[PDB]
Write a protein that binds this DNA or RNA. Structure first.
Ligand SMILES: [Mg+2]
Ligand SMILES: [Mg+2]
Lengths: 57, 97, 192, 65, 136
RNA sequence: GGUGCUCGGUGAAACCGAGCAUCCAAUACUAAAGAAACUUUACUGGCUUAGUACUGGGACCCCAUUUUUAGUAUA
């Protein structure tokens, strides 16, 4: 049961460390660049997904 | 006071009769005495000596009569050897005198 | 503003001060370290002059020069002070207190500035019908000690019915922050 | 100039006086009009005297001397 | 001028004598020219409507009338032949408590001379004294 | 070395192994709540012809000192 908690704790913690490092990079990315580049970078909408992306079979 | 109606003449038909200068002179005298009283109280508070004065008071009449009654009922309730015992130390006190 | 230090008062020194022809007050600012407030007493002529030429509920938009006078090392003293909450009476409308705040040229004091309404005669909305209401008269906001604004002149040349002047847009002097900026409340409305 | 004692004299009477002022006057030791007693100068006596300043005439021992 | 509520409730005290001299409901909050009382007097609804029409007669349609008092206090008056006792009487009329420092009629930019003119007719029909207060 | 959010571990406890916020090791504004101080005045005790006969105590709110937060910014 120690191993059973270790698998999920290690996997979820490695994944959330990856997401937080990606969040750090995307936070620090948009600062060496003028305001119009911010305006493209800070557009909070997304195109609908094309549904042709078949998952793990 | 402060009544105009009600059939009982506590005042004239006019509801009062205001203060004559004699009444105002009397109230001024009484207020001056009160002001000097509280000014003297402030001065005595500000000039009180450390370790304040205790005055000699006698026993009140109730303690006095009670303790004379108590002492007279000691005199009837003494043992047979007691006045000789008192007389021995009375002599011994004035041998050292 | 001739004043005296007023060493120890409660409510009986104040009745005797008012009979003597004086109006009490204080200055509170923490000028030196704690507040070290100074009690003072003015005259009804001085206090009537401030509440007549500057008006009650206004008058806090100026820094008057206080004069600390002895009744020399005793007859000297001049402080830069700002009015805060003059205490009027509600029956005879006489003034019973001042409660000033010391205002040196650098300060972050809160000031309640009035509204003067520049162009009432000319507006399309006022001439279609009626008049304009002033709900938020005397809008208050932060200021600096050396640059307290005596007047705020809202521009009313172009307002109509259902066209309202909000608190968010007001003439803002440099270094003079608006105290309440997150609110959107109607200072003016052309109500007919 | 230290106030060692006080001299307290009734100038008013007992009739018409409320019972709590009357009890303070009893505990000061005053029974009759124009009667002067010598009281010490401590906070107990001064509290009793400040409860009834309009009924008595207080004076310092130096003043009375 | 009537108690706009669901219950015909009853009251105990009919008085308002207390002074608010310091900054305590003493400045104008809705208008710019105000009419205030100077002594405490409980006043009835009929007087309030009569003074309101009496000063409204001297007011134009570009002048708002901010009334400050609403008659919501029931007053119980017994009939003529009823002997003293046997419970509390029926509610007869509605009244208001007036305090010495309360502004009861405050006006907008109708001219101060006309506002003073309206105050004279208001004070003629009102039981207690009235005074003039302005925004200043 | 500190508190929590819970995965479990026994003894029912509480702590242990993790892993983020500051406690330390920030400044700069804003909206909340509290703390102590205080001008004025209501309000009151005594006295009272009902307060140009007085006198003791003394708020609330605002302004100003400051603490627990939260939110928005900085390299
Ligand atoms: Mg008093
Ligand atoms: Mg008597």
């Amino acid at each position: 049961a120690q191993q059973l908690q270790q698998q999920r704790v290690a996997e979820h913690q490695a994944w959330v460390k990856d997401m937080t490092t990606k969040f750090k990079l995307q936070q620090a990315a948009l600062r060496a660049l003028p305001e119009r580049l911010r305006v493209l970078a800070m557009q909070p909408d997304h195109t609908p997904y094309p549904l042709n992306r078949k998952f793990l079979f | 006071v402060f009544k105009t109606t009600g059939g009982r003449s506590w005042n004239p038909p006019s509801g009062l009769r205001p203060l004559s200068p004699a009444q105002r002179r009397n109230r001024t005298k009484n207020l001056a005495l009160t002001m000097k009283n509280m000014s003297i109280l402030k001065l005595a508070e500000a000039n009180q000596p450390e370790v304040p004065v205790r005055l000699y008071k006698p026993l009140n009449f109730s303690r006095m009569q009670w303790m004379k009654k108590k002492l007279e009922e000691t005199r009837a309730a003494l043992g047979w050897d007691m006045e000789a015992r008192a007389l021995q130390e009375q002599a011994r006190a004035l041998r050292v005198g | 503003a001739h004043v005296r230090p007023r060493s120890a008062t409660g409510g009986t020194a104040c009745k005797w001060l008012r009979r003597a022809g004086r109006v009490p007050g204080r200055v509170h600012s923490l000028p030196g370290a704690n507040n070290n407030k100074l009690l003072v007493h003015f005259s009804e002529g001085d206090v009537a002059k401030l509440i007549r030429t500057f008006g009650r509920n206004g008058c806090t938009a100026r820094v008057l020069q206080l004069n600390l006078v002895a009744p020399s090392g005793t007859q000297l003293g001049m402080l830069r002070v700002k009015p805060t909450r003059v205490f009027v009476n509600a029956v005879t409308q006489r003034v019973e207190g001042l409660d000033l705040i010391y205002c040196p040229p650098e300060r972050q004091v809160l000031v309640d500035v009035p509204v003067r309404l520049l162009n009432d005669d000319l507006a399309p909305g006022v001439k279609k019908g009626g008049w304009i209401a002033l709900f938020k008269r005397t809008v208050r906001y932060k200021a600096l000690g050396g640059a307290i604004p005596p007047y705020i002149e809202v521009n009313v040349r172009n307002m109509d019915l259902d066209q309202d002047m909000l608190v968010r847009d007001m003439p803002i002097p440099p270094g003079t922050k608006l105290y309440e900026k997150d609110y959107n409340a109607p200072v003016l409305r052309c109500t007919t | 100039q230290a106030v060692k004692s006080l001299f307290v004299t009734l100038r008013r009477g007992f009739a018409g006086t409320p019972w709590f002022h009357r009890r303070v006057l009893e505990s000061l030791g005053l029974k009759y009009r124009h009667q002067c007693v010598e009281k010490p100068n401590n906070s107990s006596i001064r509290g009793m005297l400040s409860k009834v300043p309009h009924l008595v005439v207080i004076e310092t021992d130096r003043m009375r001397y | 001028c009537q108690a706009g509520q669901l219950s015909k409730q009853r009251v105990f005290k009919r008085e308002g004598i207390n002074d608010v001299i310091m900054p305590n409901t003493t400045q104008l909050r809705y208008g710019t020219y105000g009419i205030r009382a100077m002594a405490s007097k409980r006043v009835g609804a009929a007087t309030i409507e009569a003074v309101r029409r009496t000063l409204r007669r001297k007011i134009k349609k570009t002048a708002r009338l901010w009334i400050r008092l609403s008659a919501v206090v029931p007053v119980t008056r017994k009939p003529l032949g009823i002997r003293m006792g046997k419970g509390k009487g029926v509610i007869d009329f509605y009244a208001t408590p007036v305090r010495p420092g309360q502004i009861i009629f405050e006006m907008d930019r109708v001219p101060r001379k006309v506002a003073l003119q309206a105050l004279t007719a208001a004070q003629h029909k009102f039981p207690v004294k009235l005074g003039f207060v302005e925004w200043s």
